[PDB]
Amino acid sequence: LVKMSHPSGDVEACMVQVTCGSMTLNGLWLDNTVWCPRHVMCPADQLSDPNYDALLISMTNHSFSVQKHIGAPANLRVVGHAMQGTLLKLTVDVANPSTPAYTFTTVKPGAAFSVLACYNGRPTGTFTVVMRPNYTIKGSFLCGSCGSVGYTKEGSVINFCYMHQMELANGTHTGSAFDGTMYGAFMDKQVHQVQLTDKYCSVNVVAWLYAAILNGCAWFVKPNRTSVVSFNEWALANQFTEFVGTQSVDMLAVKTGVAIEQLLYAIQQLYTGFQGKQILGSTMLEDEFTPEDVNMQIM
Amino acid sequence: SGLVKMSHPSGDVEACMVQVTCGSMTLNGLWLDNTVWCPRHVMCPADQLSDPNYDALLISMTNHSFSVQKHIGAPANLRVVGHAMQGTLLKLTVDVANPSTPAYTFTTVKPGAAFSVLACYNGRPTGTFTVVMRPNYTIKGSFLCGSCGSVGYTKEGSVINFCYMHQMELANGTHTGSAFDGTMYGAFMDKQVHQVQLTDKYCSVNVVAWLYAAILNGCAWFVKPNRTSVVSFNEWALANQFTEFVGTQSVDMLAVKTGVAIEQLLYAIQQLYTGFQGKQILGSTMLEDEFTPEDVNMQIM
Ligand SMILES: COc1cccc2[nH]c(C(=O)N[C@@H](CC(C)C)C(=O)N[C@@H](C[C@@H]3CCNC3=O)C(=O)c3nc4ccccc4s3)cc12
Ligand SMILES: COc1cccc2[nH]c(C(=O)N[C@@H](CC(C)C)C(=O)N[C@@H](C[C@@H]3CCNC3=O)C(=O)c3nc4ccccc4s3)cc12
């Protein structure tokens, strides 16, 4: 089991640098559109309390500059601007000839996606995270990473789901979907913001227990069962997300012969502590791997 | 913690992966300029995998024995016009130079150092991850049948350093391969026989970096005034499944920034190994050695 992200090449060919005044960050160029965080527009004196409508009104196409540094580098001309939630939709005069097939999806808590971290329009690293139940991610981002992009891929279509915007007071990160809505209803302004209390992603804990059984670690499997409905009611009071079955979990159920309901019962017992024992070398429940991960990695 | 498993963006290496077939055997290869590198056991008949005679096998080959195809991006009219064997790898010469060859070197990676892996099947990139070379010359990767010829690399400036070509999964979950000079890591053999790795060890210098990352995040309950010298720690390490600590400039920057000395963390390690005393560090109840000093310097700064 490793943290496995998609190959980033197709997304690399879409990264650009966006400049507005003396401010810069990353943007994503698809077709004739460049997407980027709207706080490019924001003077340093207005970061803590910005008026984005007033700021956008004071912009012309000419306020915005877009540079591509990767591939055959190019200057693009901004021929239109618009604001969509927390994102800027610039229109440019050239279409990206390396535009992949893509959609815009919103990731759900517990689901994994790949992030391409960039600075000044240059990809520097790639990693994968799961969206946390409190709609933050446990990333690795520094000043200037804003506009870095998160995505999944089904076959050859890339599903863009995340554009990075902020690091909260705790170690964690958040950003917006490409409809422009910030995950977790956080605000793109320079203010201290307190996230909700996080939860265990139940379906990923289940996936992880199936991975243990697949590896010969099954000491926690008992005949006792907890129904999904019973589990989900118990989950409300215990900081666990609602469990929603999928095809991937069922395949692990069929492969191991252990029913989902036996592991939901197991989670309720192990949540109190492992009483001296370990599971896959761990003393705590692991929710950072998905059923798809376990399926694919241990095919 | 602000620490993730950070790989280099794979686009450079994706544009170099190809599929190499010899008879009815297939795996991945690496296309750079007029050369395609792939594991030599693509030459071996399944009946003979357990005991190959790669010298005899190579004599038996002609240029026409090998077929190379690039499926991704712009595809492949690739004709093999030369072949050769270098250690456990084949070096094939092809008549088209890869137009997307990155600046590259071949360097052997050392235990404790991290590198990016591009996992591929039948010439198609499917995933990327990063690993640290274990002190017993294995990596804890995620590889299935057909991943052979997948590549591990690091990147310095514009220069890709290719350090690993995938070859085997040992009887534990664990993986090994060769450097591009042709030598298998750990002197394993590329043949279909059971092989036992040497015992693995904690990478002391990476554990030190991780504790520094803890201090940088305000997690410093484990820091005491007590110290253990490098010499005394390294003598302790031979007795306790830890690698020799070798300090570097990257570790020094961490020590200066935090104001906690390496030797304080060497003492902390000796205590934390015996037990975390019901506490955790960066969300872990056990020492973590899969993050390098360079990792912490880059990701936390
Ligand atoms: C009292 O203030 C705080 C209290 C407690 C926690 C806090 N967090 C933040 C906060 O996150 N600010 C956002 C900015 C806001 C406006 C979205 C921000 O700095 N994003 C970074 C990535 C950040 C930085 C650290 N690593 C993270 O990934 C980024 O790349 C860029 N920002 C700008 C801004 C202007 C121009 C170019 C760029 S580029 C402020 C804050
Ligand atoms: C009784 O012998 C054993 C006892 C105990 C543990 C063992 N492990 C291995 C062993 O690993 N063999 C090598 C192959 C050898 C010869 C280096 C191998 O299967 N490589 C795989 C990747 C492996 C497979 C599972 N996931 C891993 O990454 C691969 O991709 C390909 N192999 C071939 C082989 C021939 C033609 C095309 C391809 S393509 C043998 C063995």
Numbering used by the authors:
A (entry chain A): 3 to 301
B (entry chain B): 1 to 301
Which sentences did the original study use to describe this structure?
The main protease (Mpro), also called 3CLpro (3C-like protease), represents an attractive antiviral drug target. Mpro is able to cleave pp1a and pp1ab at 11 sites, catalyzing the formation of a series of non-structural proteins critical for virus replication and transcription. In fact, a variety of studies previously demonstrated that only the dimeric form of Mpro exhibits enzymatic activity.
We also solved the crystal structures of YH-53 in complex with SARS-CoV and MERS-CoV Mpros at 2.04 Å and 1.99 Å resolutions, respectively. Compared overall, the SARS-CoV Mpro-YH-53 and MERS-CoV Mpro-YH-53 structures show high similarity with the SARS-CoV-2 Mpro-YH-53 structure, with the RMSD of equivalent Cɑ atoms being 1.040 Å and 1.322 Å, respectively. The main differences for YH-53 interacting with Mpros of SARS-CoV-2, SARS-CoV, and MERS-CoV were observed at the P1′ and P3 subsites. In the case of the MERS-CoV Mpro-YH-53 structure, the benzothiazole ring of YH-53 flips over and moves outward from the active site when compared with SARS-CoV-2 Mpro-YH-53 and SARS-CoV Mpro-YH-53. This binding feature also helps to build a hydrogen-bonding interaction between the benzothiazole group and Ser144, but deprives the hydrogen-bonding interactions between YH-53 and residues Thr190 and Gln189. Furthermore, it is the nitrogen atom of the benzothiazole that interacts with His41, but not the sulfur atom, which forms a hydrogen bond. In addition, the main chain carbonyl group at the P2 subsite forms a hydrogen-bond interaction with a water molecule. YH-53 inhibits MERS-CoV Mpro with an IC50 value of 3.103 µM.
